[PDB]
Amino acid sequence: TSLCCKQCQETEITTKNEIFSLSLETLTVYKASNLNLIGRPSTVHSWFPGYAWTIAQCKICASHIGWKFTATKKDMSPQKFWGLTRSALLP
Ligand SMILES: O=C1CC[C@H](N2C(=O)c3ccccc3C2=O)C(=O)N1
Ligand SMILES: [Zn+2]
């Protein structure tokens, strides 16, 4: 169930336990680890209306794994989640 950065191999980014389905490839998970955020949130072209995105890269190898999505309104659930490019992860 560990999902690790495919590039550096050793760095766990999330687990299968964290996977969920947002009502509307890209894996969406409630929680992730060992990612650094680059820049500030943007709503431009957001794949999840009502959320803004921030680039998220592996803390070890700087590979771009996906994005942190943050809610633009307080009344939403989850207030944030991660959308991760499946091919960037092992398994
Ligand atoms: O929700 C998202 C995440 C970011 C993603 N995105 C990209 O992957 C990209 C590549 C090049 C130029 C502009 C973009 C962009 O907005 C995108 O289109 N929407
Ligand atoms: Zn890595």
UniProtKB/Swiss-Prot annotation:
The chain holds residues 322 to 427 of 445 of the full protein. It comes from the Eukaryota. The CULT domain binds thalidomide and related drugs. Thalidomide binding leads to a change in substrate specificity of the human DCX (DDB1-CUL4-X-box) E3 protein ligase complex, while no such change is observed in rodents. This is Protein cereblon. Zn(2+) binds at residues 5, 8, 58, 61. Residues 1-91 form the CULT domain. Disruption phenotype: No obvious phenotype, however mice display increased BK channel activity and a subsequent decrease in synaptic transmission and presynaptic release probability in excitatory synapses. Mice also display cognitive behavioral defects such as abnormal passive avoidance, hyperanxious behavior and decreased preference for new objects. Treatment with the BK blocker paxilline rescues all synaptic and behavioral abnormalities except for hyperanxiety. Brain and synaptic morphology is normal and long-term synaptic plasticity is not affected. Highly expressed in brain.
